[PDB]
Design a protein around this ligand. Structure first.
Ligand SMILES: [Zn+2]
Ligand SMILES: [Zn+2]
Ligand SMILES: [Zn+2]
Ligand SMILES: [Zn+2]
Lengths: 15, 114
């Protein structure tokens, strides 16, 4: 539920 | 050649682990990533190892193949196959913003189990 993100993963967030 | 987009080493040389591995090379542009670095799994790593995978920047809906409404695209982190939640067989609303296993892995799942 948090936006910490252990890495990045796909999903592509603007470039 | 290539390298993980996290350490920039290679599929036989980890930059942050000093040991060999096996990145994920995109079948569109050609950028790679360490599966362990992408938080990938065995099915994903294995899957993406043999097939396209395509980095997220070149992503697309295996269903559509246009990556248009990627805001709905579902990145099966078990092979990478992207499906707009409303493209799937048993569509979802949002939930698979990370996990998810697409139909390929799933049917393989149902088959795997016993
Ligand atoms: Zn790495
Ligand atoms: Zn790419
Ligand atoms: Zn689609
Ligand atoms: Zn899958």
């Amino acid at each position: 539920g948090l936006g910490k993100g252990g890495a990045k993963r796909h999903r592509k967030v603007l470039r | 050649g290539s390298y993980c987009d996290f350490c920039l080493g290679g599929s036989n040389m980890n930059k942050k682990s000093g040991r060999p591995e096996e990145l994920v090379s995109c079948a569109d542009c050609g950028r790679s990533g360490h599966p362990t670095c992408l938080q990938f799994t065995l099915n994903m790593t294995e899957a993406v190892k043999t097939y396209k995978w395509q980095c997220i920047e070149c992503k697309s809906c295996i269903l559509c193949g246009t990556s248009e409404n990627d805001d709905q695209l579902l990145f099966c982190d078990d092979c990478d196959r992207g499906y707009h939640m409303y493209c799937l067989n048993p569509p979802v609303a949002e939930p698979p913003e990370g996990s998810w296993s697409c139909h390929l892995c799933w049917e393989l799942l149902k088959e795997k189990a016993s």
